[PDB]
Design an enzyme around this catalytic site. Structure first.
Site, PDB file in Angstrom:
ATOM      1  N   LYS A  62       0.827  -1.206   0.000  1.00  0.00           N
ATOM      2  CA  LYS A  62       0.000   0.000   0.000  1.00  0.00           C
ATOM      3  C   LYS A  62       0.863   1.259   0.000  1.00  0.00           C
ATOM      4  CE  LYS A  62      -2.119  -1.650   3.571  1.00  0.00           C
ATOM      5  NZ  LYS A  62      -1.515  -3.000   3.371  1.00  0.00           N
ATOM      6  N   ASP A  65       3.782   7.173  -0.550  1.00  0.00           N
ATOM      7  CA  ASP A  65       4.819   8.187  -0.373  1.00  0.00           C
ATOM      8  C   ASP A  65       4.783   9.160  -1.544  1.00  0.00           C
ATOM      9  OD1 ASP A  65       7.844   7.501   1.387  1.00  0.00           O
ATOM     10  OD2 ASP A  65       7.286   9.450   0.546  1.00  0.00           O
ATOM     11  N   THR A  69       9.991   8.565  -3.975  1.00  0.00           N
ATOM     12  CA  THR A  69      10.168   7.450  -3.061  1.00  0.00           C
ATOM     13  C   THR A  69       9.326   6.250  -3.489  1.00  0.00           C
ATOM     14  OG1 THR A  69      10.686   8.960  -1.257  1.00  0.00           O
ATOM     15  CG2 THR A  69      10.039   6.718  -0.658  1.00  0.00           C
ATOM     16  N   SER A 117     -11.129  -1.373   4.233  1.00  0.00           N
ATOM     17  CA  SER A 117     -12.151  -2.162   4.916  1.00  0.00           C
ATOM     18  C   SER A 117     -12.445  -1.912   6.392  1.00  0.00           C
ATOM     19  CB  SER A 117     -11.830  -3.646   4.741  1.00  0.00           C
ATOM     20  OG  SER A 117     -10.607  -3.979   5.381  1.00  0.00           O
ATOM     21  N   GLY A 171     -11.047  -8.202   3.971  1.00  0.00           N
ATOM     22  CA  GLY A 171     -12.072  -7.969   4.972  1.00  0.00           C
ATOM     23  C   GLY A 171     -13.030  -9.137   5.091  1.00  0.00           C
ATOM     24  N   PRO A 179     -17.750 -14.273   2.004  1.00  0.00           N
ATOM     25  CA  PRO A 179     -17.128 -14.715   0.751  1.00  0.00           C
ATOM     26  C   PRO A 179     -18.032 -14.575  -0.473  1.00  0.00           C
ATOM     27  CG  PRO A 179     -16.481 -16.158   2.502  1.00  0.00           C
ATOM     28  CD  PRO A 179     -17.598 -15.301   3.051  1.00  0.00           C
ATOM     29  N   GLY A 180     -19.195 -15.218  -0.418  1.00  0.00           N
ATOM     30  CA  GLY A 180     -20.129 -15.175  -1.531  1.00  0.00           C
ATOM     31  C   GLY A 180     -20.636 -13.795  -1.901  1.00  0.00           C
ATOM     32  N   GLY A 192      -7.049 -13.646   5.282  1.00  0.00           N
ATOM     33  CA  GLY A 192      -5.875 -13.825   6.110  1.00  0.00           C
ATOM     34  C   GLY A 192      -6.116 -14.682   7.337  1.00  0.00           C
ATOM     35  N   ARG A 193      -6.431 -14.027   8.448  1.00  0.00           N
ATOM     36  CA  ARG A 193      -6.648 -14.702   9.724  1.00  0.00           C
ATOM     37  C   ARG A 193      -7.611 -15.882   9.732  1.00  0.00           C
ATOM     38  NH1 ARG A 193      -7.769  -9.232  12.833  1.00  0.00           N
ATOM     39  NH2 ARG A 193      -8.315  -8.728  10.660  1.00  0.00           N
TER      40      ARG A 193
HETATM   41  O1  U5P Z   1      -8.576  -2.064   3.107  1.00  0.00           O
HETATM   42  C1  U5P Z   1      -7.736  -2.895   3.355  1.00  0.00           C
HETATM   43  C2  U5P Z   1      -6.404  -2.987   2.791  1.00  0.00           C
HETATM   44  C3  U5P Z   1      -5.570  -3.970   3.193  1.00  0.00           C
HETATM   45  N1  U5P Z   1      -5.980  -5.017   4.067  1.00  0.00           N
HETATM   46  C4  U5P Z   1      -5.055  -6.146   4.291  1.00  0.00           C
HETATM   47  O2  U5P Z   1      -5.705  -7.331   3.875  1.00  0.00           O
HETATM   48  C5  U5P Z   1      -5.473  -8.416   4.808  1.00  0.00           C
HETATM   49  C6  U5P Z   1      -6.776  -8.811   5.475  1.00  0.00           C
HETATM   50  O3  U5P Z   1      -6.474  -9.874   6.384  1.00  0.00           O
HETATM   51  P1  U5P Z   1      -7.570 -10.513   7.342  1.00  0.00           P
HETATM   52  O4  U5P Z   1      -8.443  -9.464   7.976  1.00  0.00           O
HETATM   53  O5  U5P Z   1      -8.387 -11.591   6.514  1.00  0.00           O
HETATM   54  O6  U5P Z   1      -6.771 -11.242   8.374  1.00  0.00           O
HETATM   55  C7  U5P Z   1      -4.344  -7.887   5.682  1.00  0.00           C
HETATM   56  O7  U5P Z   1      -3.065  -8.224   5.131  1.00  0.00           O
HETATM   57  C8  U5P Z   1      -4.572  -6.409   5.694  1.00  0.00           C
HETATM   58  O8  U5P Z   1      -3.427  -5.658   6.072  1.00  0.00           O
HETATM   59  C9  U5P Z   1      -7.258  -4.957   4.697  1.00  0.00           C
HETATM   60  O9  U5P Z   1      -7.604  -5.780   5.517  1.00  0.00           O
HETATM   61  N2  U5P Z   1      -8.056  -3.897   4.292  1.00  0.00           N
HETATM   62  O1  U5P Z   2       4.817  14.469   2.877  1.00  0.00           O
HETATM   63  C1  U5P Z   2       5.829  13.816   2.896  1.00  0.00           C
HETATM   64  C2  U5P Z   2       6.103  12.653   3.716  1.00  0.00           C
HETATM   65  C3  U5P Z   2       7.271  11.996   3.576  1.00  0.00           C
HETATM   66  N1  U5P Z   2       8.348  12.497   2.787  1.00  0.00           N
HETATM   67  C4  U5P Z   2       9.656  11.818   2.886  1.00  0.00           C
HETATM   68  O2  U5P Z   2      10.605  12.759   3.342  1.00  0.00           O
HETATM   69  C5  U5P Z   2      11.854  12.642   2.616  1.00  0.00           C
HETATM   70  C6  U5P Z   2      12.086  13.893   1.786  1.00  0.00           C
HETATM   71  O3  U5P Z   2      13.342  13.718   1.119  1.00  0.00           O
HETATM   72  P1  U5P Z   2      13.914  14.772   0.080  1.00  0.00           P
HETATM   73  O4  U5P Z   2      12.841  15.313  -0.831  1.00  0.00           O
HETATM   74  O5  U5P Z   2      14.672  15.908   0.894  1.00  0.00           O
HETATM   75  O6  U5P Z   2      14.938  14.001  -0.685  1.00  0.00           O
HETATM   76  C7  U5P Z   2      11.708  11.309   1.895  1.00  0.00           C
HETATM   77  O7  U5P Z   2      12.176  10.229   2.710  1.00  0.00           O
HETATM   78  C8  U5P Z   2      10.241  11.209   1.639  1.00  0.00           C
HETATM   79  O8  U5P Z   2       9.800   9.889   1.369  1.00  0.00           O
HETATM   80  C9  U5P Z   2       8.138  13.624   1.937  1.00  0.00           C
HETATM   81  O9  U5P Z   2       9.004  14.036   1.192  1.00  0.00           O
HETATM   82  N2  U5P Z   2       6.879  14.198   2.037  1.00  0.00           N
HETATM   83 CL    CL Z   3      -2.777  -4.929   1.336  1.00  0.00          CL
END
Ligand code: U5P
Ligand code: U5P
Ligand code: CL
Ligand code: CL
Lengths: 213, 213
Positions: A62, A65, A69, A117, A171, A179-180, A192-193
């Site tokens: 997810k 940045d 980055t 979720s 979720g 599921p369905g 997951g879990r």
């Molecule tokens: O909106 C989102 C985005 C990502 N995940 C990810 O999906 C998986 C759901 O796992 P579980 O709740 O079935 O254990 C995890 O890896 C979790 O970090 C969510 O649950 N919801």
């Molecule tokens: O809003 C944000 C949040 C995080 N960073 C992080 O801060 C650093 C900025 O680096 P630079 O642009 O001075 O190289 C990087 O690690 C970048 O991922 C941003 O630049 N902006």
């Molecule tokens: Cl994810």
């Protein structure tokens, strides 16, 4: 995706993660690996999964940045063997495009996470989710992630991205999603879990597949 | 933070990251390590920095998952030695609280990222930033991250969190932010490329500090 079921392997030690994945390998061919496992065991774990199971790997990072980055994170992730990476859409179009650029260069895929979720997603993400989905469509994104916990929202997301787009949804199970019901709109569910914490992961996976045969 | 200057070490190989940090160690005592370095070299790199430089380490991970996963990410990160972790505020209060719980348990710190510094932040994050900041205040968050690239937004953020709160700001240098102007509102500035990509990192850091004396 085999059986429309993607395993979210969030256990935090290699032995357990590999053991459980092995227990359900006959039911899946796609595994989502996230930071809980990668930060605990190293990015090399991705290559381990691919070699041991010959499975597709989606890095559930997810990415959220700035563009520069995001490019680095995607590069490191794809070099590690990930077939696809999940990117947050909330940070905007430039941050998404940065990921698309690296994916195109390396021949990999990007999944755009629209609405999340969990309950907190209602505070800021939900109100922007439809526009985030449209942003993805306008940029040619074909893979999306939507919430199993809100069927009507998942349905709306499907309407926006169209039938041709690929939609996966987390979720299901632990968070309350069915599921369905989720598969009425999503092409595949992320679980997951409900599987990896189950007394018998294989029976858990089989049960889910049974309810959606 | 020494000299109100935090180094964003986003180089992607151990030798270069350690060499450059060593070149500017006399000017800083706080380093922000993110995914570009951690995913490339492993989480053990955090411990390496702490033992080699005796510096404070802020994990710039911008955690943005559901509560349960956020807890796992924070736990893995603090176990690796991070003194603090940066958390995205857009996913909501429950996701933030999950991080606060682990930080409380392990005696570490949480920095709440409100508005981001890149252009895309204007699409969805900016409109929610003031409320995300208020959310942090209501939960007792004392450390925040705001954009150097938008002085008036950074100023508004400072007004919301109060003089009491600690505010750090990225976007200085490469992204166009000015050190002095940013420090009118932030307690410390985050600087990455302007230093680690400079022909002479030490001279670059000295120059920034000079204009801030
Ligand atoms: O909106 C989102 C985005 C990502 N995940 C990810 O999906 C998986 C759901 O796992 P579980 O709740 O079935 O254990 C995890 O890896 C979790 O970090 C969510 O649950 N919801
Ligand atoms: O809003 C944000 C949040 C995080 N960073 C992080 O801060 C650093 C900025 O680096 P630079 O642009 O001075 O190289 C990087 O690690 C970048 O991922 C941003 O630049 N902006
Ligand atoms: Cl994810
Ligand atoms: Cl950061």
């Amino acid at each position: 995706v085999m059986n429309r079921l993607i395993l979210a392997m969030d256990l935090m030690n290699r032995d357990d993660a590999l053991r459980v994945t092995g227990e359900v390998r006959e039911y899946i061919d796609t595994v989502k690996i996230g930071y809980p496992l990668v930060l605990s065991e190293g990015m090399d774990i991705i290559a381990e999964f691919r070699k041991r199971f010959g499975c597709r790997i989606i890095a559930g990072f997810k990415v959220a940045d700035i563009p520069e980055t995001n490019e680095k994170i995607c590069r490191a992730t794809f070099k590690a063997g990930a077939d696809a990476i999940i990117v947050h859409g909330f940070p905007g179009a430039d941050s998404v495009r940065a990921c698309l650029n690296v994916a195109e260069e390396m021949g990999r895929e990007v999944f755009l996470l629209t609405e999340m979720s969990h309950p907190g997603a209602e505070m800021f993400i939900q109100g922007a989710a439809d526009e985030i989905a449209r942003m993805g469509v306008d940029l040619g994104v074909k893979n999306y992630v939507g919430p199993s916990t809100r069927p009507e929202r998942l349905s709306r997301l499907r309407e926006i991205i169209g039938q041709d787009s690929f939609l996966i949804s987390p979720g299901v199970g632990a968070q309350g999603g069915d599921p369905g019901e989720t598969l009425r709109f999503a092409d595949a569910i992320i679980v997951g879990r409900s599987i990896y914490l189950a007394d018998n992961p294989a029976a858990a996976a089989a049960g889910i597949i049974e309810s959606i045969k």
